[PDB]
Design a protein around this motif. Sequence first.
Motif, PDB file in Angstrom:
ATOM      1  N   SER A 207      -3.486   3.232  -4.863  1.00 44.04           N
ATOM      2  CA  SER A 207      -3.055   1.783  -6.148  1.00 44.04           C
ATOM      3  C   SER A 207      -4.604   1.422  -5.705  1.00 44.04           C
ATOM      4  CB  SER A 207      -2.983   0.626  -4.880  1.00 44.04           C
ATOM      5  OG  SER A 207      -0.686   1.329  -4.582  1.00 44.04           O
ATOM      6  N   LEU A 208      -5.804   1.690  -6.313  1.00 50.24           N
ATOM      7  CA  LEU A 208      -6.910   1.463  -6.883  1.00 50.24           C
ATOM      8  C   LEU A 208      -6.743   2.445  -8.059  1.00 50.24           C
ATOM      9  CD1 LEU A 208      -9.417  -0.713  -5.639  1.00 50.24           C
ATOM     10  CD2 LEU A 208     -10.773   1.487  -5.800  1.00 50.24           C
TER      11      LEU A 208
ATOM     12  N   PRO B 208      -4.959   2.404 -10.830  1.00 49.42           N
ATOM     13  CA  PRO B 208      -4.573   2.053 -12.158  1.00 49.42           C
ATOM     14  C   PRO B 208      -5.364   0.267 -12.184  1.00 49.42           C
ATOM     15  CG  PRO B 208      -2.678   1.743 -10.028  1.00 49.42           C
ATOM     16  CD  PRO B 208      -4.852   2.640  -9.131  1.00 49.42           C
ATOM     17  N   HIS B 209      -6.161  -0.220 -11.175  1.00 49.14           N
ATOM     18  CA  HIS B 209      -6.342  -1.347 -12.456  1.00 49.14           C
ATOM     19  C   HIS B 209      -8.078  -0.195 -12.988  1.00 49.14           C
ATOM     20  CE1 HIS B 209     -10.193  -4.181 -11.878  1.00 49.14           C
ATOM     21  NE2 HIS B 209      -8.642  -5.277 -12.021  1.00 49.14           N
TER      22      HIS B 209
ATOM     23  N   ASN C 160      -7.577   0.266 -16.740  1.00 55.51           N
ATOM     24  CA  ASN C 160      -7.267  -1.122 -16.978  1.00 55.51           C
ATOM     25  C   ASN C 160      -8.866  -1.357 -17.423  1.00 55.51           C
ATOM     26  OD1 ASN C 160      -7.350  -3.794 -17.421  1.00 55.51           O
ATOM     27  ND2 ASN C 160      -4.993  -3.185 -17.833  1.00 55.51           N
ATOM     28  N   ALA C 161      -9.957  -1.400 -16.712  1.00 54.59           N
ATOM     29  CA  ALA C 161     -10.650  -1.736 -17.076  1.00 54.59           C
ATOM     30  C   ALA C 161     -11.547  -1.623 -17.856  1.00 54.59           C
ATOM     31  CB  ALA C 161     -11.708  -1.745 -15.476  1.00 54.59           C
TER      32      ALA C 161
END
Length: 19
Positions: A3-4, A6-7, A10-11
């Motif tokens: 769950s890390l 997905p971030h 995005n960045a």
Amino acid sequence: FLSLIPHAINAVSTLVHHF
């Protein structure tokens, strides 16, 4: 815990946004 990623993606998409 999965769950890390997905971030991170995005960045990056931000770099292509500004630059």
